[PDB]
Design a protein around this ligand. Structure first.
Ligand code: HEM
Ligand code: HEM
Ligand SMILES: CNCc1cncc(-c2cc(C)cc(N)n2)c1
Ligand SMILES: CNCc1cncc(-c2cc(C)cc(N)n2)c1
Ligand SMILES: C[C@H](O)[C@H](O)[C@H]1CNc2nc(N)[nH]c(=O)c2N1
Ligand SMILES: C[C@H](O)[C@H](O)[C@H]1CNc2nc(N)[nH]c(=O)c2N1
Ligand SMILES: [Zn+2]
Lengths: 418, 414
């Protein structure tokens, strides 16, 4: 029984949910790893096809949790499902989720995502079951439908598309893209980078796979889709599906001349969805942006588009010394522009003040009904204006509940080509 | 064993071996991280004190390349005799200085630790009365302030004995502004110091009842009732806050003091507890301009500044708070620099901490660091520390929090 305190409101919450955590955080009583990006390699089953005594306990735990969730623990259907999962594992070394279980699992993986400030929405998730998919062409179809549904002409809707779970580890479904929609990055002859430097390696793989790069600053990358462990295949997302927002400023009419844009749909496609010991290595999910993700990280990280210098110049700021806070001043204007632009174009976006306030409300809801809410302060606090958002002053407990979204190796590090 | 930390901006990877030398708890478990908890997770017996003391003496003599020396062994013998006969022991001056510097070096929440080895240590262990504490603190303030060219300093009062004779500075900082709750529910001055202001008034302080009243010192010697002292105003350097572009900013009437001097922590050195150990450095601008000025629970000036900026405050997505916050922090840095009062902006400070951290990994095997505290409260990811993975663990000597003295002091007069 742990208490968390909000140091602004003095609200104290009492956490009991953490008693159900399964995986190591990476911390010990002697060392905290809370700012380590990937602190733990503690997985719930070994790398590939578990034996029965390895997979069934995880399956039983999830089925138990699901039937508990619907007030049916020990019910006829609960005991049959256990027997059913038992026979499936006995005869196939794995088992297949029911549609209801898949949906429950996906929503709870989002609900359990301690790094996500958006989880007040967790039960409003549209789940696309793509477990019947067999080819990269089918994956492209599924992803196109996801993008179209989720974009919804700018009125974004949260969605996840779940491709067939891992079997032996050599037949993985993978979206090689880190997000469904991202811009290419190009190594320049002189040594600078054009476009998004984060995606230089992936872009080079696409180029080497036969993609014809237009070699601009905002080239939407093709999809690089791997089905059933085969070599990945390139697909161009129909551009009418890729909603983009030109970035302009409500006051600085020169801002539009910077030629900046961003896409409207944040769609993570490189993570692993773990449910009942089953691993869904291709499970692209999307919601809608918090403005700072684009305005602070995508635009202003030194290793990303790195636009602070360009914006500050146009603003006529004293960039000679750090103490003029010219980076801070330009940072704010950039984020004003990003929000103003999405809002002007009626593309769903949330500012970090509203998003963090919702997350506090979500925490209170979760403590009241669930007895806790795992939360990673290091990720929840926005990357600008931290302490003027409420989450900065909110103590959080971080712990790992299942089902979950997990990181996984980039496929080009593990894929043996054909 | 080794642990690697990565910087995700530079891809520099550093290897921590120093964490193996911790034996104090972080508060986390193997299954729960308490890294964002402010305060996670009665005097030492003879048995408890012996190994704490040995560990410190061992590390002191290792630091000076005299481990195993005759002086090392005689010092351990001598420390053991004092603990055996007196239930405590006395640090040598060299050990006190070393211990104070390393408590700073070990302060995982402190971004300014590149300066750790240039600490002026004032040994006040001969002090016996609150008047003597006031004298020591005045000298500390004067030395540290240095007419605006601030110098890091700590003054160390007698260690805890039986826990019934503690020396304590009741102030949370040596220099802080009073807060007064008004009958209408508003607060004049600093709302964070309302409770301590009330204690001062109760003890006889006659308050000016203004917005920036420097608080009196409330000083406790030898476990006696604390006593009030007015810091001589000529020793309190203050900076009126103005803005390089907004002429109206000075009309806000803002000022701050130049000397950040924490006075409510406990210094632990080799099992010894120095419950009064005020220390001071210089400010990072955001401490004042973001937290002191713009916390909703503090001076909370965002609204007023945004109004004078004619910002649209009807919607949060105008980012009017963010825009006002930057200008306030510009004003803070401009004002201190104009008055030649030492101050460091969060970009320079975090950059220096990264260099410090890397140096520490190189020469010491690591640098315990609390990312939640190291990352500045504004513009987080445009400072390098945001992208720096850090390991947090507790090394000793250390600065520790301790309960506020008014919650444990049992009063004596009448
Ligand atoms: C609906 C609006 C949503 C908002 C505003 C939101 C906000 C955020 C933000 C700002 C981050 C940090 C991303 C980064 O710093 O790189 C994040 C991370 C995350 N989100 Fe959400 N999110 C939303 C929806 C979703 C959905 C639908 C899912 C899954 C079904 C999800 C799962 C996650 C996970 C697993 C992470 C951390 C993993 C990672 O990206 O490294 N989120 N979210
Ligand atoms: C020399 C310039 C220094 C700078 C720029 C600096 C910077 C900072 C900052 C910005 C914080 C966070 C304060 C807060 O958010 O409340 C902090 C905390 C801390 N500093 Fe430093 N500091 C300096 C000197 C020192 C010195 C001389 C000591 C001790 C001898 C020290 C020990 C600590 C400790 C123990 C903490 C965490 C305790 C606490 O306040 O909660 N620092 N420092
Ligand atoms: C490693 N972080 C990956 C990443 C990068 N960009 C954006 C997001 C993201 C994802 C989702 C579902 C919503 C949102 N608002 N944002 C995640
Ligand atoms: C809980 N933290 C207390 C506090 C409050 N204000 C300022 C500081 C501080 C202290 C020191 C030595 C240096 C600095 N640059 N800042 C510490
Ligand atoms: C090292 C540090 O943990 C790393 O830079 C983290 C910090 N907090 C973050 N927070 C969010 N939301 N997203 C991130 O990518 C990061 N990066
Ligand atoms: C809840 C959270 O841990 C708390 O608000 C912390 C966050 N980080 C901080 N960081 C610094 N430097 N100073 C602080 O007071 C805090 N407060
Ligand atoms: Zn931890």
């Amino acid at each position: 029984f742990l208490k968390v305190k909000n140091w602004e409101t003095e609200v104290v919450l009492t956490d009991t949910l953490h008693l159900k955590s399964t995986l190591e955080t990476g911390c010990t009583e002697y060392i905290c790893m809370g700012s380590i990006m990937h602190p733990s390699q503690h997985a719930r089953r070994p790398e590939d096809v578990a034996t029965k005594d390895q997979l069934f306990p995880l399956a039983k735990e999830f089925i138990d949790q699901y039937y508990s969730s619907i007030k049916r623990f020990g019910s006829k259907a609960h005991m049959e499902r256990l027997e059913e999962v038992n026979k499936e594992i006995d005869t196939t070394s794995t088992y297949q989720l029911k549609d209801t279980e898949l949906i429950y699992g996906a929503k709870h993986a989002w609900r359990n995502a301690s790094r996500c400030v958006g989880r007040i929405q967790w039960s409003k998730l549209q789940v696309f079951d793509a477990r019947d998919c067999t080819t990269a062409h089918g994956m492209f179809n599924y992803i196109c439908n996801h993008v179209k549904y989720a974009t919804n002409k700018g009125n974004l809707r949260s969605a996840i598309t779940i491709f067939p779970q891992r079997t032996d580890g050599k037949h993985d479904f993978r979206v090689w893209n880190s997000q469904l929609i991202r811009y290419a990055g190009y190594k320049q002859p002189d040594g600078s980078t054009l476009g998004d430097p984060a995606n230089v390696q992936f872009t080079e793989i696409c180029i080497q796979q036969g993609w014809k790069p237009p070699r601009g600053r905002f080239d939407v990358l093709p999809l690089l889709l791997q089905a059933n462990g085969n070599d990945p295949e390139l697909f161009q997302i129909p551009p009418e599906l890729v909603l983009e927002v030109p970035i302009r400023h409500p006051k600085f009419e020169w801002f539009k001349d910077l030629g900046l844009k961003w896409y409207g749909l944040p769609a993570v496609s490189n993570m692993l969805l773990e449910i009942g010991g089953l691993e869904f290595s291709a499970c692209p999910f999307s919601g809608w942006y918090m403005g700072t993700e684009i305005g602070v990280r995508d635009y202003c990280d030194n290793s990303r588009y790195n636009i602070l210098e360009e914006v500050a110049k146009k603003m006529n700021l004293d960039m000679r010394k750090t103490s003029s806070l010219w980076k801070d001043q330009a940072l704010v204007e950039i984020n004003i522009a990003v929000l103003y632009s999405f809002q002007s174009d009626k593309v769903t976006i949330v500012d970090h003040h509203s998003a963090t306030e919702s997350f506090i409300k979500h925490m209170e809801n979760e403590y009241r009904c669930r007895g806790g809410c795992p939360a990673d302060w290091v990720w929840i606090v926005p990357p600008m204006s931290g302490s003027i958002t409420p989450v900065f002053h909110q103590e959080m407990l971080n712990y790992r509940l299942t089902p979950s979204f997990e990181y996984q190796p980039d496929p080009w590090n593990t894929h043996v080509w054909k």
